[PDB]
Amino acid sequence: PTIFEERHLKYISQLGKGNFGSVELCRYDPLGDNTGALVAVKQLQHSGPDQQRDFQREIQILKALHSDFIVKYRGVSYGPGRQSLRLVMEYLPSGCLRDFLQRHRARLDASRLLLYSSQICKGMEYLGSRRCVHRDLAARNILVESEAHVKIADFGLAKLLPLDKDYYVVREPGQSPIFWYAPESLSDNIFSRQSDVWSFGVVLYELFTYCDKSCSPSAEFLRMMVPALSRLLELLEEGQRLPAPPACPAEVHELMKLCWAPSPQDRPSFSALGPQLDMLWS
Ligand SMILES: CC(=O)N1CCC(Nc2cccc3cnc(Nc4cnn(C)c4)nc23)CC1
Numbered sequence: 001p002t003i004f005e006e007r008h009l010k011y012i013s014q015l016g017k018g019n020f021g022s023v024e025l026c027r028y029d030p031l032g033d034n035t036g037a038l039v040a041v042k043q044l045q046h047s048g049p050d051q052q053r054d055f056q057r058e059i060q061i062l063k064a065l066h067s068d069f070i071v072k073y074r075g076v077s078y079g080p081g082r083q084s085l086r087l088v089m090e091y092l093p094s095g096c097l098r099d100f101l102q103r104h105r106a107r108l109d110a111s112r113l114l115l116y117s118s119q120i121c122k123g124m125e126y127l128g129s130r131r132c133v134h135r136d137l138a139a140r141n142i143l144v145e146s147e148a149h150v151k152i153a154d155f156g157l158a159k160l161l162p163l164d165k166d167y168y169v170v171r172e173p174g175q176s177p178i179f180w181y182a183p184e185s186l187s188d189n190i191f192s193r194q195s196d197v198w199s200f201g202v203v204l205y206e207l208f209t210y211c212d213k214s215c216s217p218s219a220e221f222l223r224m225m226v227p228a229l230s231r232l233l234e235l236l237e238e239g240q241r242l243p244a245p246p247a248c249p250a251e252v253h254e255l256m257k258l259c260w261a262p263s264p265q266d267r268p269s270f271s272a273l274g275p276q277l278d279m280l281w282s
């Protein structure tokens with residue numbers, strides 16, 4: 001049931017790409033009559049030993065995640081031997097939250113944004129409970145299941161923390177837009193559940209700006225600003241932060257600023273954030 005035959009997976013279109021991977025819309029069509037269910041299918045864009053090790057890790061992480069707020073693992077398709085060729089996941093036609101916010105902004109009030117915030121927070125609370133660091137939390141990596149339901153996706157950079165260590169150090173620079181990284185990530189490539197909280201603060205910013213490009217983190221940096229990464233680290237060290245989005249509830253902007261505490265140990269846990277978002281929502 002969790003094993004998909006390659007010859008039954010019919011290619012339809014590209015859904016997205018990044019971090020050496022593509023996600024394709026396929027039909028799983030064993031009848032070959034175009035009546036089969038649609039699935040989102042991730043594969044490496046091209047072969048590579050390091051990317052393959054990372055891909056098998058991603059499959060093993062997502063397979064073991066069971067949450068209303070995490071994109072659903074369906075199964076795998078196999079290449080030669082035990083080599084995973086494709087990761088088969090549920091298809092969410094509404095696509096990424098970034099796109100959904102830009103298109104439907106006139107329809108989505110503060111209450112709805114707080115509902116999405118609460119759901120992402122509950123997803124991240126669960127990830128933390130599994131000792132999983134996402135490392136790439138952003139509105140582009142959150143999917144819309146329905147009007148009132150979002151799910152976290154994109155576990156391509158996710159890592160499991162050992163039982164005796166609450167952070168990990170990456171050797172090579174990140175390739176994600178720099179405006180979502182915590183200062184300790186920008187400076188020393190240190191990632192933790194607390195660096196995911198920093199990124200969640202930027203996701204709250206994205207939600208309450210409806211991902212408007214004109215007040216994007218990039219746009220704000222270029223107005224607020226030496227290599228860009230060093231300049232951003234300097235601004236953050238000075239205590240400069242993204243401004244309150246237009247018409248943003250003061251309490252929501254206060255929560256963003258707590259997520260952006262300079263020291264990771266001073267940032268609120270997702271467990272602490274959850275009730276505060278739920279309180280604002282109702
Ligand atoms: C922004 C970007 O390039 N991304 C890569 C592709 C990713 N898409 C999905 C990954 C995993 C499971 C998915 C299930 N459904 C969908 N649906 C969908 C519809 N339109 N789009 C763009 C995505 N995407 C998934 C979103 C982020």
Ligand SMILES: NC(=O)Nc1ccccc1
Pocket residue numbers: 179201202217218220221224235240241242260
């Ligand atoms: N977290 C936060 O406020 N980041 C930031 C600051 C200035 C420009 C772009 C991003």
